[PDB]
RNA sequence: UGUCCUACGCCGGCAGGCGCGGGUAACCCGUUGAACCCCAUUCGUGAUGGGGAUCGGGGAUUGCAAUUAUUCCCCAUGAACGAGGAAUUCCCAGUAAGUGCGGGUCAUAAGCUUGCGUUGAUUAAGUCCCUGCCCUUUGUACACACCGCCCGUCGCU
């Protein structure tokens, strides 16, 4: 299902290239969940995230 | 769909191999395509080949009418040699489906294209 | 830049990339001497009938070329399109629609030959997480080494965007198997080279002295022309 | 400077091989003469065929 | 410290890298 | 393949083009030349017969496109 | 930028020809009436009014001399080319790119090289995966080095 979070923090510039970056992000719908997350593009804080599997937290060293 | 096509096809699945050949075949429209005949080619692809492969392949697309034995020559018969010209490589089945004896999967060959996925 | 990022060939590979190719003349003369070159890059004997495979076939203008030699070829593809527009551009030989890399369904002893265009290259990333390039490689390879007949040969053409894909490439054809090497056509030049692997089923001893005198650091004669020199018979 | 890119892009494949060779070994059993000195290219000799490449594979 | 280590060890470095690039009269 | 629009009106065409055309909801030379087809140019021209007899209601004019719909 | 730049008048359809003025120059070309762009017409998916190569005829111009076409103009021919399997170049804002105009080389080219203005963006504000170069630590892995195998069989002088 289709659930919508907002990013809190962002960790930093991961990847190969530096092509990801690794965030920290809350849930709107309940305000006390919270994952890491990779996303591509250029992110600032504030910025709100669709994810359609909000199961898993990604990972890169 | 070319004779020695599907009489040299096997089963390329992980457990049955190397044994899912031959395939059992069946037709619902059968077209003749004009193909030029080297003699020598249908002489060397018949030692080549199972004969009872071909009696159980005609027998599953209802045809009876075939030489039961190799025949092997130096290409001096011509209607032997033009017959399994017209059988092989001139009888195409463009509407068709295959069924593996081995595994069960299903293969249809539509238009004149057999599918082999996973 | 290139078509192997595009992603899996049943996506970029779709009808618009078909009608596309199709309408190429550059496509048409270059795939048309690379299949030429495939052709004779195998030692098949001359005015000798002969079973060929053309994997990779897509438009069959490879087929196209060896059913202008008189040979006859099956043709296996992955994509749709390709076979689409190939059966419409009215080929001779027989087509399947199958990937290679799960294993090619054919009895051993079978083909003479065997010929590759454009297509050994797309084995060497992974495109989903189920897939495992040297699994499949692996398997493609030693599905080569069962269905042909034992010293029979297979020409294999590439454009390997770097040297990793070719250690891959050739470790898991090794260790099927196989015996052969490259043909690395025009090596040194760029736009005609075309990489096709091809395989098939079976006075001194006074200058040390000086050096050492001179490493042991006392004075040296200067090194000239008559350093090690006879100067006369000794009777 | 597009040479020496070209030339070491080269020597590392070359190199790539040459390691590939020993544990291909183990867990189992190029145009320099070609090569012009005055451009970059593909010179024809008359006492061998045209320019190419052979790697043999172990 | 181990627990400093594997933090460190499975996070990523961020920060520090600087790029020169590019009236009323 | 090859198109083959008319160069000039058939009758067939001409009383279908008259009944047909002026209720579509958008009337460009593009699009009664795709759907009846026929060349552009005279596509243009019949578009300009049918704002002349006062039919069709022109919505803006430019060199590149040129654009009418149905008066109601 | 200019003692070859040129205004203007007349002739020829055009290249061009004749005459008469200005300029050793923010004084004259020059309020540098540039092209893209903008506004209307024709065109209609057609190797076609796209594309111009290569040719046939004639005219004009610079040169002692244009043949193997110096250069330009007019009419005719309308080839390949349908967005390039594959190797790679440059680039982060008035920038890339589209678009014209100047300077040097020059009796005549355009054909390089330098510049200028006009219209004006997509992506990015990261990384050390590839390449280059600079560091630091190290010479423990691999390679070298050391040892071992160093291929066997008969056949005659
Ligand atoms: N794993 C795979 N299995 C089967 N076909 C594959 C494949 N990976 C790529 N291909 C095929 O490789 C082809 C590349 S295009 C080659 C066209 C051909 N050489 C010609 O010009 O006649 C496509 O048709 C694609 O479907």
């Known amino acids: 299902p289709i659930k919508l979070a907002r990013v809190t923090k962002v960790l930093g510039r991961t990847g190969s290239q530096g092509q990801c970056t690794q965030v920290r992000v809350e849930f709107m719908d309940d305000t006390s969940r919270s994952i890491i997350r990779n996303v591509k593009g250029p992110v600032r804080e504030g910025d709100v995230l669709t994810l359609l599997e909000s199961e898993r937290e990604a990972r890169r060293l | 769909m070319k004779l020695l096509t599907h009489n040299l096809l096997s089963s390329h699945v992980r457990g049955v191999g190397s044994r899912g050949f031959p395939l059992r075949l069946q037709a619902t429209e059968v077209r003749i395509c004009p193909v030029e005949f080297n003699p020598n080619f249908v002489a060397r692809m018949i030692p080549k080949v199972e004969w009872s492969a071909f009696l159980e392949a005609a027998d599953n697309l209802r045809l009876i009418q075939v030489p039961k034995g190799p025949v092997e020559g130096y290409e001096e018969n011509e209607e032997f040699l033009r017959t399994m010209h017209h059988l092989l490589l001139e009888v195409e089945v463009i509407e068709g489906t295959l069924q593996c004896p081995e595994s069960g999967r299903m293969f249809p060959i539509s238009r004149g294209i057999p599918n082999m996925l996973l | ?235 | 400077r597009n040479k020496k890119h070209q030339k070491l892009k080269h020597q590392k494949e070359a190199e790539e091989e040459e390691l590939e060779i020993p544990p291909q070994y183990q867990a189992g059993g190029p145009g320099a003469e070609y090569k012009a000195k005055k451009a970059k290219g593909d010179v024809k000799k008359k006492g061998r065929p045209d320019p190419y490449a052979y790697i043999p594979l172990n | 410290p181990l627990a400093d280590q594997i933090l460190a060890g499975n996070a990523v470095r961020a920060g520090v890298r600087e790029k020169r690039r590019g009236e009323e009269y | 393949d090859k198109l083959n629009n008319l160069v000039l009106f058939d009758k067939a065409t001409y009383d279908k083009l008259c009944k047909e055309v002026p209720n579509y909801k958008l009337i460009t030379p593009a699009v009664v030349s795709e759907r009846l087809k026929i060349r552009g140019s005279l596509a243009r021209a019949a578009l300009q017969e049918l704002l002349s007899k006062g039919l069709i209601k022109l919505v803006s004019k430019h060199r590149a496109q040129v654009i009418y719909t149905r008066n109601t």
């Open chain 3, 1 to 235: 830049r290139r078509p192997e990022h595009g992603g899996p060939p049943e996506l970029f590979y779709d009808e618009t990339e078909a009608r596309k190719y199709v309408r190429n003349s550059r496509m048409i003369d270059i795939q048309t001497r690379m299949a030429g070159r495939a052709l004779e890059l195998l030692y098949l004997p001359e005015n000798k009938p002969c079973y060929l495979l053309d994997i990779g076939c897509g438009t069959g203008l490879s087929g196209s070329y060896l059913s202008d030699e008189g040979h006859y070829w099956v043709g296996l593809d992955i994509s749709p399109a390709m076979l689409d527009e190939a059966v419409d551009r009215e080929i001779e030989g027989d087509l399947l629609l199958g990937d290679m890399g799960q294993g090619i369904p054919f009895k051993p002893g079978t083909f003479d030959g065997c010929i590759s265009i454009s297509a050994v290259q797309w084995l060497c990333n992974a495109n989903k997480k189920s897939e495992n390039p040297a699994k499949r490689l692996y398997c493609f390879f030693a599905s080569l080494f069962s269905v042909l007949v034992r010293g029979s040969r297979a020409v294999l053409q590439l454009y390997p965007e770097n040297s990793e894909q070719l250690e891959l490439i050739t470790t898991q054809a090794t260790k099927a198997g196989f015996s052969g090497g490259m043909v690395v056509d025009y090596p040194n030049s760029a736009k005609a080279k075309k990489f096709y692997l091809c395989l098939f089923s079976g006075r001194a001893w006074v200058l040390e002295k000086k050096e050492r005198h001179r490493r042991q650091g006392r004075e040296v004669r200067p090194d000239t022309q008559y350093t090690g020199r006879k100067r006369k018979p000794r009777f």
